Fold Heat shock protein HSP 90-alpha.
Amino acid sequence: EVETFAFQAEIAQLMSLIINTFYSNKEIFLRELISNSSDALDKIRYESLTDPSKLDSGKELHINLIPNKQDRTLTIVDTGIGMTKADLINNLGTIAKSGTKAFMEALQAGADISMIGQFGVGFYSAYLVAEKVTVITKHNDDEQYAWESSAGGSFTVRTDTGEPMGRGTKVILHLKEDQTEYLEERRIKEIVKKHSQFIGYPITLFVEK
Ligand SMILES: Brc1n[nH]c2cnccc12
Ligand SMILES: Brc1n[nH]c2cnccc12
Ligand SMILES: Brc1n[nH]c2cnccc12
Ligand SMILES: Brc1n[nH]c2cnccc12
């Protein structure tokens, strides 16, 4: 069972601007998704302060970066709080409509795309390098779900029959053909060290065969 939704017009306008505007500093996508993972990890840790059983789905709080050259995918895995089905449909738990409004007004007022994170819509920078994004997520209060979109004005949500996640979120970036540099080991370390050096969680860059 697959449900297909239309993006709100403002969100579809945001993704098309990200996809079509000439902008070379594409590496900021990783900082934004890592920052999102850190926020999700902060929340589940806070809830565990008064209810330790919230970590029964996994006590480890970490971020993994998994490149796969054969699939041409870069996967950002975290064990944060995760998202419910309603959160996924609700623009992945953000106020993306009002956040996009402020972002596009800043852009005409001198801003550039790299400041997208200060507006709560940093997730959509993933489409600087990915032609398709798959979000697998598991919240303690819901089942495991899969969110997917190749832009084009629509996204799908389905029950995920894949590997059970325990708790957290998996962001799978199906990279564009000319953006495979973000699967190289030394390129990812350089980006993590320059934009994410103060994330308060272990970031493990998986290596390949
Ligand atoms: Br948890 C969660 N849901 N949506 C988010 C967007 N940015 C950071 C964290 C989250
Ligand atoms: Br939106 C988003 N990007 N990365 C995440 C990790 N956990 C929850 C929500 C998100
Ligand atoms: Br943590 C978290 N849950 N939902 C969010 C939306 N924006 C930023 C951070 C979060
Ligand atoms: Br929870 C939550 N929903 N939306 C948010 C925005 N910023 C921080 C936390 C949240």
